[PDB]
């Protein structure tokens, strides 16, 4: 995915950390190499087509070197808690159409002027409770959002029961009220969704929304029937897809830019990251200043993406190696 | 070196974009045998009785479905044991297990030594009966390939303190103007800009030519360039004439022989050339022409059948003199060898091979090992150049000064638009270039091993 | 910012600032020119019309 | 997809262990705790 | 690669064997599905995108169904044992150029009229044993064949110390005389090489070769100095690179034929063959016949693949299932 | 068999007999035809420039 | 030494080579060398930092880095994007001789 | 630096910096005025402030 | 010699270290002066014409400071060991003229195009031992090289007897067969000569050479009768002539660029370096950066030399002082 650069960026996958230039057998393996004087730093990575060495980092031209976890890159999915405003009525009105309008921005197009609205309607009856109303609202919402004919997975509808306010239960176009037995439902959660991803073609994007309610006549007066309270996100979008689009881009600087342009006559680059893994990152920013007249700084950055296992191992070791090699004091994750 | 490069034509492109050409080749094939099986599928070993006795049936296994039904396929012993495809192929995943029948009157069978791995088969014909004939046969196709080349860029600079503007020289010892050859020439020039206006040009064209010819490729097999510029971007070097050619049709010897050479040159001429057009013009250094001479002699010296007489050879010729009325000279040199076919080995010694500056390895028999090196540069005749040096249209080189108050390169004496305050000037020059040899196999080269690795 | 078709492969892409030929190759603006006035015909003595 | 860069960005993957600005990025896998990155 | 079809060929990978349509979760799962009547047969496969099923096989219209082993599909690398014939001389003959010519028939082209000749030279000296000669010849062969400059791999030279007639001491252009400290070398093995392979553009080919010797004057008569005999191969090229191109071709029948053609406007097919594994195969040929005038047959091929652990455990259980399901009696290799 | 240059993908591919369309996509003689006259502009009321 | 494009140092008896230029040893392209910076001075010697070009991935034989080895100037290759300065030029001078009666 | 992609100049007689790049610079000085702010009444919703 | 400069270089000789500018009485006396904040560093030198102070070093702007010993600058004289190769013959072959050819590459001119060859001839006889051959050969080489009588042979020649394999035996055109008595001579050594040096106009150059042999006839082939293998040097031209030209050049940046041009109408410059002594060296590189819009750098070196006396006592004291004063930690060679 196209991004902004400070005149260049590079990426190298640390699939395994070795201790010598003689142990780079498998691809992805990497070692940090620095003088004992600690004047330069570079990385020997094992490429699928052999071995390589990253550009050399003059440790006195180092701007900032920071390690980033994976939790900080996992997009947190926006939730909206939806309920009945007890001000108008803590229960449904027995003849009013409770319509809900989810306005969407950044639908297919790129802009905010790309608006898109889906609805959910429930005409309420006499003996109706809040639980039954929330249930029917979720079904109406799913049949329009969680269906199998909509080109995009707009949202994810859920239901929560006061007995278990921690457990959320999904609702799809296939779900039926008989599957929803609990009589204590108090809200409707509406998350975002991980959209389709395509390496180098379709970057990881989202479509946010606002639940905008419509008015009901409660006592001869137009009044809104609900409130859309944001709650703490619960689901996330792992970074595997971000790191793979970063690698796909950063392997077009030290490599082929005609990735597929002219199909039989190409150079097939062998990317090394698994879009289904969670990586933890390390970005070292530094520059190159020349001699007497050439004082201008050519700023540079290189990224190292290792794998995470809950704990941030595979980078604390990488960090310790770079720290003992270059003397830099980088913080562990 | 400059003459060597001017022996090649130039191609003008439109931009600095990787380019490719189409490579179209040859068609006629023959299929290897993987296995042969008895009437019962039992594979035939090598030490076994013949098979197909009494026109009995058996199975042939191949790595491809290339033969059709009712066709007659022949092995290495063409037409002695003919096989008939009496049934479509039953594929074992990629191998086409045919069923066959001997169809040439064969009665004793076919030995188990002609039904072994490697046996090559071609296609004869699909014969059928006069009346009530049913369908047989099929047809077959092929497809070509392509190749690629890249470019590169070079840069030179030289900075000059501003006081060198109109800086006359005492000329106590005469001033010198280094030349391309290597020769110095006493020059009458008081201003010292005359002697930087020459070296930047000289050093820059030397950069070009040395890269054009002796450049290497920085790229990996994944496609990644491996040396990264100070800016951080990767450097994209191409490859020189020599590197592009020596990937194919290049031998490394520790000992030269007209035996070795003629075998190479004849085998090639047979596989590639007509009876005529086998005239090769080897290019070498003086030490090689000597090495050629001595070996042609070692060979002719083995022609113990004939007798060589100076009446026709004239290795001892009469010269006029005053020390005698019958005074003789004595000397000769072999320069050709017409081997038993239209193959003919002439020579062309070029000084580019004897230069001892470029060439640092020394042949123990004298000179530089690069003169003991034989290069055939144009095998056959191609409708278009196989070797051409590439240039871009309008985007070739850029000049520019980064100076302060005084520009000695121009004599400006006053700067409206200053670059800096340090009373100095820099000159910058950048140029792009590349070369292509379409076919590396259309050039032969016999090289000494000490020039290797 | 979603998939309209079923096989829609591209997505609306965006970058800020200084670009690179990589940026242009990532948005499909760099392609290798095919040298049409160049063609290697592999050489052999074709003994098939004999 | 395409990003914005400070004149270059180069990524190395540790699968098994005037100024012109440059950035080098190292990634590695997470196993729930942050090992293989505090190992970098 | 491209192959010849008997009007169609389908491929399906069998990574894991399940017992139900419900157990198909991972993209390589497979079930042989048939009815108690044993009248039809089909396979339920798990694709990167959902479940799929193969065309239905009429168990009365099966022409043949044979499982090939992985060993059968590995190309054996033909190797010679080069020596000096004791009839001319059992030891080198000083001052003679012991030249050796290696011919290559299917060089870059694919015809037998596209030949290529590489040479090896050794000039003999007094006191030269046979081991010393073979050493020097293997070295001169490597420098000309196994160099870092040749566009393609051509041969694998080896040496055999008669004290260990089994181990094939290798040789490369980097190897130097001193690295070979034995004195009982008795042959120069010359083995063909695995040529490079890329999925769907470079079929798995080989360049076959014959060693041609040259003459030497021994007692006044030009005589050949050596004898090249083929010996039972010992290195086989597995079928990973072969099944993979098979898939690449046979997946454009179920799916897209425009592979990568208009680079950004493409359907990216996900393949399940690992080109670093070893698969058995199970090909089944059958046909469809119509009703009362369309009696013409339409023979249609279907083949299945499964990794080999060395004992063919995966495919054996596979067909044991197919036999319990379809009544057939395919043989458990 | 084998390659001649350092970056070469294609090999000489051969087949026999019946030629389906999977063959024609395996020799790179199939491509999706770019529909030039068909092009969608996404519908929105552009409050920019206002 | 130059394993994995690691950098090393080529000490010399004078300062004759510039930054970014590629100098070639006795083998003249088998082992290309790229100058990583300007020459640091050790007395009158010029100590450079180098790294192998030419796709090298195995190094350069230590026998190819001993005293007396000869090095020439091949070219100064530079990146295509945002290219900072590299190179230099060089000079010479004559000699004279005498006689008497 | 040595060449201008903006104006198309390939040779630089007065180089600014040695790195081969080109940065544009544009600045404006602007102003706006209402003579009498009593002459405009507004009814702003309360959610748009604070 | 004409060295290269990164915008300037300067040298200051240090014959004594005095610790105070009041203690500077005789020439060469030096003291490193640095404030207590270690913001600037300079050197006060006792010039023969008084006192001078080095430019002031902004200690924030020091690039590299390394002290190099004298051994690191002593050119080692390339030796050789010429012998008969037992491969061909471990003894002289009677009737064959064992010509040896010395090949000189950098002869008067600078280039390798300027070659020069000096030969040596020895025709062998019956019973001629190896020692006797090496003897007559050394003599022929000497009488052909040293027979110039002007300055010096182009190479020095030595014999070595197996009794004392370390002790050399000089051989010059004055030497006689009778002078050489021992019979266990193994080899001929050919070392290169220290050519003449002249402060300012004849720098420390050399003439490199390789002994090229010429071919003789053994059993039936032309053959090189010997091998020229290099042995470890045993003589090093000392530094004195090298530092002296450094000063002669680095004292035209402080003093006059005219040295003798208008000969009588010129300045006498007093150079403080004894060209017949060994000197360690200490180069410091630093720059100056301006205030605003003047961030260009002006790099500049300051060299310091001190006589080596076995152990490097003079320079290690100077280093220790500069460290306690400037706060650097230059390493003591």
Among G87, G38, G34, G86, CA closest to G60: G34
* CB E112, CB E106: distance < 8 Å: yes
* CB C38, CB B384: distance < 8 Å: yes
**Quick one: three-class SS letters along B306-338?**
CCCCHHHHCCEEEECCCCCCCEEEECCCCCCCE
The length of chain I is 333
Chain C residue with Cα closest to E266? C9
Distance CA B437, CA B76 (A): 38
* CB I67, CB G43: distance < 8 Å: no
Among A279, A77, A277, CA closest to A191: A77
Distance CA I135, CA H46 (A): 114
Distance CA A293, CA A288 (A): 13
Other beta carbons within 10 Å of B418 = 13
Distance CA B81, CA B124 (A): 12
Strand pairing category for I29-34 and I16-17: parallel
Residues in G touching B202 (Cβ below 8 Å): 89
Query: What is the DSSP track for I162-199?
Result: STTSS--EE--TT--GGG---S-EEEEEEEEP----BT
Among F20, F38, F16, CA closest to F30: F20
Q: What are the backbone dihedrals phi and psi of residue A151, each rounded to the nearest 5 degrees, phi first?
A: -60, -25
Distance CA A227, CA B97 (A): 74
Query: What is the DSSP track for B1-59?
Result: -HHHHHTS-EEEESSS--EEEEEE------EEP-EEE-TTSPBP-SSS--B-TTS-EEE
HSE (CB half, 13 Å, CA atoms) of E195? 25
Distance CA C38, CA B146 (A): 11
Q: Is B209 left (phi over 0), alpha (psi -120 to 50) or beta?
A: alpha
Residues in C touching E267 (Cβ below 8 Å): 7, 9
Among B188, B191, B192, B132, CA closest to B158: B192
* CB A148, CB A142: distance < 8 Å: no
Query: What's the gap in Å between the CA of F44 and the closest CA on chain A?
Result: 6
The single-letter DSSP state of residue A163 is: T
The single-letter DSSP state of residue I240 is: H
Among A191, A292, A202, A215, CA closest to A1: A202
Residues in D touching C20 (Cβ below 8 Å): 5
Q: What token pair was written down for A7?
A: 């005149």
Q: What token pair was written down for H44?
A: 């702003």
Distance CA B97, CA B117 (A): 14
* CB B86, CB B57: distance < 8 Å: yes
Distance CA A52, CA A31 (A): 11
**Quick one: three-class SS letters along chain G?**
CCHHHCCEEECCCCCCCCCCCEEECCCCCCCEEEECCCCEEECCEEEEEEEECCCCCCCCCHHHCCCCCCCEEEECECCCCCCCCCCCCCCCCCCCCCCCC
Question: Helix, strand or coil for residue B413?
Answer: coil
Say yes or no: G25 contacts chain B, CB-CB below 8 A: yes
Cα A191 → chain centroid: 14
Q: What token pair was written down for I261?
A: 């041009």
Say yes or no: A300 contacts chain B, CB-CB below 8 A: yes
Other beta carbons within 10 Å of B350 = 15
Query: What is the DSSP track for E163-220?
Result: GGSSS-EE--TT--GGG---S-EEEEEEEE-PPP-BTTTB------EEEEE-EEESSS
Q: What token pair was written down for B297?
A: 């002699």
Query: How large is the C-alpha radius of gyration of chain A?
Result: 27
Q: What token pair was written down for E168?
A: 């094939």
DSSP β-bridge partners for residue E42: E33
Other beta carbons within 10 Å of B380 = 15
DSSP β-bridge partners for residue E103: E117, E210
Residue with tokens 């081997």: B339
Q: How far is CA B208 from CA A60, B291, E132, I228, in A?
A: 35, 33, 46, 38
Q: How far is CA I165 from CA A14, B347, C25, I91, I160, in A?
A: 56, 50, 69, 19, 6
Q: What are the backbone dihedrals phi and psi of residue A255, each rounded to the nearest 5 degrees, phi first?
A: 170, -155
* CB I58, CB I208: distance < 8 Å: no
Residue with tokens 């609990």: A182
Residue with tokens 């064949």: E145
Pairs from I60-63 (Cβ < 8 Å, separation ≥ 24): I61/I286, I61/I287, I61/I288, I61/I289, I62/I284, I62/I285, I62/I286, I62/I328, I63/I285, I63/I286, I63/I287, I63/I299
HSE (CB half, 13 Å, CA atoms) of I88? 20
Distance CA F35, CA F37 (A): 6
Q: Quickly list H helices, B95-171.
A: none
Residues in A touching E264 (Cβ below 8 Å): 201, 260
Residues in G touching A290 (Cβ below 8 Å): 84-85
Query: What's the gap in Å between the CA of G18 and the closest CA on chain H?
Result: 16
Distance CA G73, CA B370 (A): 19
- Name the E strands within F1-50: 15-16
Distance CA B97, CA B62 (A): 6
To the nearest 10 degrees (0 to 180), the angle between helices B286-300 and B258-272 is 90
Among E27, E82, E26, CA closest to E269: E27
**Quick one: three-class SS letters along chain D?**
CEEEEEEEEEEEEEEECCEEEEEEEEEEEEEEEEEEECEC
Distance CA I317, CA I310 (A): 14
Residue with tokens 């005053």: B322
Distance CA E150, CA B248 (A): 6
Query: Positive or negative, the Cα torsion across A17, A21, A27, A32?
Result: positive
Q: What token pair was written down for D12?
A: 């190395």
* CB E14, CB E305: distance < 8 Å: yes
Residues sharing a CB contact under 8 Å with residue G21, sequence separation 6 or more, in sequence order:
G34, G35, G73, G74, G75, G76, G86, G87, G88
Residue with tokens 């290792």: A306
Distance CA E1, CA E280 (A): 18
Q: Which of B172, B356, B364 sits opposite I112 (nearest CB)?
A: B356
Q: What token pair was written down for B170?
A: 């005492």
Residues sharing a CB contact under 8 Å with residue I315, sequence separation 6 or more, in sequence order:
I67, I280, I282, I306, I308, I332, I333
Strand pairing category for B10-13 and B387-392: parallel
Distance CA I26, CA I48 (A): 8
Distance CA I122, CA I216 (A): 12
Say yes or no: D22 contacts chain B, CB-CB below 8 A: yes
Distance CA I257, CA G30 (A): 44
User: What resolution (Å)?
Assistant: 4.4
Distance CA E132, CA E84 (A): 13
Question: Helix, strand or coil for residue E135?
Answer: helix
The single-letter DSSP state of residue I98 is: -
All chains having 3 or more CB pairs closer than 8 angstroms to chain E = A, B, C, F, I
Residues in F touching B64 (Cβ below 8 Å): 14, 16
Question: Helix, strand or coil for residue A107?
Answer: coil
Residues sharing a CB contact under 8 Å with residue F45, sequence separation 6 or more, in sequence order:
A113
Largest CA-CA distance found in chain A, in angstroms, rounded: 87
* CB I148, CB I178: distance < 8 Å: no
**Contact call for A264 and E198, based on CB within 8 A:** no
Q: Cα torsion at I18, I20, I23, I25 (round to 10°)?
A: 80
Alpha carbon distance, N-terminus to C-terminus of chain I: 26
* CB D27, CB D40: distance < 8 Å: no
Q: Is A314 left (phi over 0), alpha (psi -120 to 50) or beta?
A: left
Among E153, B97, A242, E247, CA closest to F2: E153
Strand pairing category for A185-191 and A156-161: antiparallel
Question: Helix, strand or coil for residue A6?
Answer: strand
**Quick one: three-class SS letters along H25-42?**
CCCCCCCCCCCCHHHCCC
Q: What token pair was written down for I4?
A: 């290269």
Q: What angle do CA I252, I255, I261 make, to 5 degrees?
A: 65
* CB B263, CB E120: distance < 8 Å: no
- Per residue in I247-278, is it b (16+ CB within 10 Å) or e — as a string? bbbbbeeeeeeebeeeeeeeeebeebbebebb
Q: What token pair was written down for A308?
A: 């995470």
Other beta carbons within 10 Å of A328 = 17
Cα E317 → chain centroid: 25
Chain A residue with Cα closest to D21? A299
Among A256, A224, A244, CA closest to A89: A224
Say yes or no: G81 contacts chain C, CB-CB below 8 A: yes
Question: Helix, strand or coil for residue A250?
Answer: helix
Question: Helix, strand or coil for residue B293?
Answer: helix
Query: Positive or negative, the Cα torsion across B107, B112, B116, B120?
Result: negative
Q: How far is CA D40 from CA A323, F25, G48, I70, I208, in A?
A: 8, 46, 31, 42, 51
Other beta carbons within 10 Å of B46 = 11
Alpha carbon distance, N-terminus to C-terminus of chain C: 66
Helix %, strand %, coil % of chain C (to 5): 10, 20, 70
DSSP β-bridge partners for residue D14: A14
Question: Helix, strand or coil for residue A262?
Answer: coil
DSSP β-bridge partners for residue E52: E45
The single-letter DSSP state of residue A202 is: B
Among B76, B59, B167, B87, CA closest to B119: B76
Say yes or no: F22 contacts chain E, CB-CB below 8 A: yes
Q: What token pair was written down for E17?
A: 């064997």
Among I250, I272, I305, CA closest to I27: I272
The single-letter DSSP state of residue A255 is: S
F and D touch per CB criterion (3+ pairs under 8 A): no
Query: What is the DSSP track for I249-298?
Result: HHTSSSS-S-SSSSSSSS--------TTS-EEEEEEEEEEE-SSS---EE
Chain C residue with Cα closest to D1? C13
The single-letter DSSP state of residue E134 is: H
Distance CA I102, CA I120 (A): 8
Residues in A touching C13 (Cβ below 8 Å): 1-2, 203
Q: Cα torsion at I10, I15, I17, I18 (round to 10°)?
A: -110
Cα I166 → chain centroid: 23
Other beta carbons within 10 Å of H13 = 16
Q: What are the backbone dihedrals phi and psi of residue B268, each rounded to the nearest 5 degrees, phi first?
A: -65, -50
Among G9, G72, G69, CA closest to G41: G9
Q: Which of residues 252-311 of A touch I (CB under 8 A)?
A: 291-293, 295
* CB I103, CB I212: distance < 8 Å: yes
């Amino acid at each position: 995915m196209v991004i902004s650069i400070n005149q260049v960026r590079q990426l190298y996958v640390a699939k395994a950390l070795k201790a010598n230039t003689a142990a780079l057998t498998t691809a992805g393996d990497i070692v940090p190499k620095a003088d004992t004087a600690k004047t330069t730093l570079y990385f020997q990575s094992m490429s699928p087509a052999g071995i390589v060495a990253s550009d050399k980092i003059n440790l006195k031209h180092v701007l900032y070197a920071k390690a980033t976890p994976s939790e900080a890159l996992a997009h947190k999915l926006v939730r909206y808690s939806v309920t009945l405003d007890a001000d108008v009525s803590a229960t449904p009105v027995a003849g009013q159409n409770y319509i809900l309008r989810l306005a969407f921005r950044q639908y297919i197009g790129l802009s905010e002027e790309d608006q898109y609205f889906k609805y959910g309607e429930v005409i309420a009856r006499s003996g109706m409770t809040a639980s039954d109303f929330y249930k029917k609202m979720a079904i109406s919402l799913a049949k329009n959002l969680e269906n199998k004919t909509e080109s995009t997975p707009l949202v994810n509808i859920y239901l929560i029961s006061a007995a278990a306010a921690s457990t959320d239960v999904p609702v799809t176009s296939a779900t039926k009220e008989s599957d929803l037995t609990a009589t204590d439902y108090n809200q409707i959660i509406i998350e975002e969704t991980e959209q389709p991803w395509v390496l180098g073609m379709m970057p990881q994007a989202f479509i946010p929304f606002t639940p905008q309610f419509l008015t009901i006549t409660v006592d001869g007066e137009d009044r809104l029937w609900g409130v859309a309270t944001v709650v703490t996100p619960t689901k996330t979008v792992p970074d595997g897809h971000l790191i793979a689009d970063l690698e796909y881009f950063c392997m077009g600087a030290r490599g082929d830019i005609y990735r597929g342009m002219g199909y039989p006559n190409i150079i097939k680059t062998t990317y090394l990251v698994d879009p289904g893994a969670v990586y933890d990152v390390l970005d070292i920013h530094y520059f190159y200043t020349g001699s007497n007249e050439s004082v201008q700084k050519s700023e540079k950055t290189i990224t190292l993406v290792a794998v995470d296992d809950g704990s941030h191992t595979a980078m604390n070791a990488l960090i310790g190696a770079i720290n003992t090699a270059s003397g830099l004091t980088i913080a562990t994750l | 070196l400059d003459t060597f490069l001017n022996s090649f034509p130039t191609r003008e492109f439109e931009d600095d974009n990787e380019y490719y050409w189409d490579v179209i080749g040859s068609s006629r094939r023959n299929i290897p045998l993987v296995e042969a099986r008895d009437e019962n599928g039992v594979v035939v070993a090598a030490n076994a009785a013949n098979v197909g006795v009494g026109t009995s049936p058996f199975y042939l296994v191949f790595p491809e479905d290339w033969f059709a039904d009712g066709e007659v396929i022949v092995g290495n012993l063409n037409q002695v044991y003919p096989f008939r495809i009496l049934g479509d192929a039953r594929m074992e995943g990629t191998n086409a297990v045919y069923k066959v029948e001997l169809m040439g009157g064969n009665t004793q069978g076919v030995p188990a030594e002609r039904l072994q791995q490697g046996e090559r088969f071609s296609i004869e014909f699909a014969p059928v009966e006069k009346e009530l004939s049913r369908k047989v046969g099929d047809v077959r196709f092929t497809s070509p390939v392509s190749m690629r080349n890249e470019w590169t860029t070079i840069r030179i600079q030289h900075k000059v303190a501003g006081n060198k503007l109109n800086k006359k020289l005492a000329m106590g010892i005469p001033m010198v103007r280094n030349l391309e050859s290597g020769k110095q020439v006493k020059d009458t020039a008081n201003m010292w800009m005359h002697y930087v206006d020459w070296e930047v040009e000289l050093q820059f064209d030397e950069y070009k030519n040395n890269a054009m010819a002796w450049g290497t490729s920085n790229r990996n097999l994944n496609g990644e360039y491996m040396n990264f510029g100070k800016s951080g971007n990767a450097i994209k070097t191409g490859a020189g004439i020599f590197e592009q050619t020596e990937v194919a049709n290049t031998m490394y010897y520790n000992t030269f022989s007209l035996k070795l050479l003629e075998d190479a040159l004849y085998e090639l001429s047979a596989s590639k050339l007509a009876m005529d057009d086998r005239l090769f013009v080897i290019k070498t250094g003086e030490r090689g022409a000597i090495q050629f001479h001595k070996e042609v002699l070692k060979t002719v010296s083995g022609w113990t059948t004939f007798v060589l007489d100076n009446n026709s050879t004239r290795v001892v010729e009469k010269v006029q003199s005053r020390l005698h009325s019958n005074a003789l000279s004595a000397g000769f040199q072999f320069v050709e060898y017409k081997a038993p076919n239209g193959v003919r080995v002439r020579l062309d010694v070029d000084p580019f091979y004897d230069d001892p500056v470029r060439n640092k390895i020394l042949h123990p028999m004298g000179g530089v090992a690069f003169s003991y090196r034989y290069d055939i540069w144009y095998i056959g005749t191609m409708d278009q150049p196989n070797i051409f040096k590439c240039k871009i249209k309008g985007d070739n080189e850029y000049r520019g000064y980064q100076w302060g108050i005084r520009n000695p390169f121009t004599g400006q004496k006053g700067n409206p638009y200053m670059s800096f305050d340090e009373d100095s000037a820099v000159i910058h020059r950048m140029a792009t270039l590349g070369v292509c040899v379409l076919d590396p196999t259309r050039t032969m080269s016999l090289i000494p091993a000490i020039l290797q690795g | 910012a979603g998939k309209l078709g079923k096989f829609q492969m591209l997505g609306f892409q965006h970058w800020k600032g200084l670009t690179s030929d990589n940026h242009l190759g990532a948005i499909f603006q760099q392609a290798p020119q095919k040298a049409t006035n160049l063609m290697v015909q592999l050489l052999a003595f074709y003994r098939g019309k004999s």
